Design a binder for this molecule. Structure first.
Ligand code: MG
Length: 207
């Protein structure tokens, strides 16, 4: 129940204006910083992974790449290089002023060729933004989120043993959403999805 605890901590510390400083303290104390690198071999050919492997953008047209087994050939998705089968981990993602993006984790054994809906039942635990101002969790059905402010930077937190995945506004420390009590039985990868063509990339913050 640690990520449940911290959700409630963030309300408690809001009453004293210490929600940001609390966030920075507990994330460092409790969660190992995943130093997340994007795996170019997994990226849909319409996506571009930066040379430093921290940023992803969309191309106008697909690139000519091999259809190797690890590559998403339909979903506009890319994975981090390493997966987690235990412990507590976190990473922060700069979403900036992008009007569309989805992030979170997925199972190692998600279907990478063709389409299935991105939902927990298919091994995706993600949330994000669409159409400039619609924040949603990619549940079945989709759940609308009401956020007091648009986040520019998002913290993703995995507690594998307890089965919790949390999302925080990493600038002000406010809770966005938690998937509670999931029964993981597979390795989990960080996952990132971009549909739109926009000037701003999606960028992982280094550990
Ligand atoms: Mg497609």
């Amino acid at each position: 129940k640690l990520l449940e605890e911290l959700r409630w901590r963030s309300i408690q510390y809001a009453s004293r204006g210490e929600r940001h400083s609390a966030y920075n303290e507990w994330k460092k104390a409790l969660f190992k910083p995943a130093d997340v690198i994007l795996d170019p071999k997994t990226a849909n050919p319409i996506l571009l992974v930066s040379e430093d492997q921290r940023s992803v953008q969309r191309a106008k047209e697909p690139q000519d790449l091999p259809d190797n087994p690890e590559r998403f050939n339909w979903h506009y998705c890319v994975l981090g290089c390493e997966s987690f089968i235990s412990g507590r981990h976190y990473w922060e993602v700069e979403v900036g002023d992008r009007k569309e993006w989805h992030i979170g984790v997925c199972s190692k054994n998600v279907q990478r060729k063709g389409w299935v809906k991105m939902t927990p039942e298919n091994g995706f635990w993600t949330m994000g933004l669409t159409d400039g101002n619609k924040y949603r969790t990619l549940t079945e059905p989709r759940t609308n989120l009401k956020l007091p402010k648009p986040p520019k930077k998002v913290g993703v937190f995995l507690d594998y043993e307890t089965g919790d995945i949390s999302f925080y506004n990493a600038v002000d420390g406010s809770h966005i959403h938690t998937f509670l009590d999931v029964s993981f039985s597979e390795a989990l990868y960080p996952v990132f999805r971009i549909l739109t063509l926009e000037p701003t990339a999606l960028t992982i913050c280094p550990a």
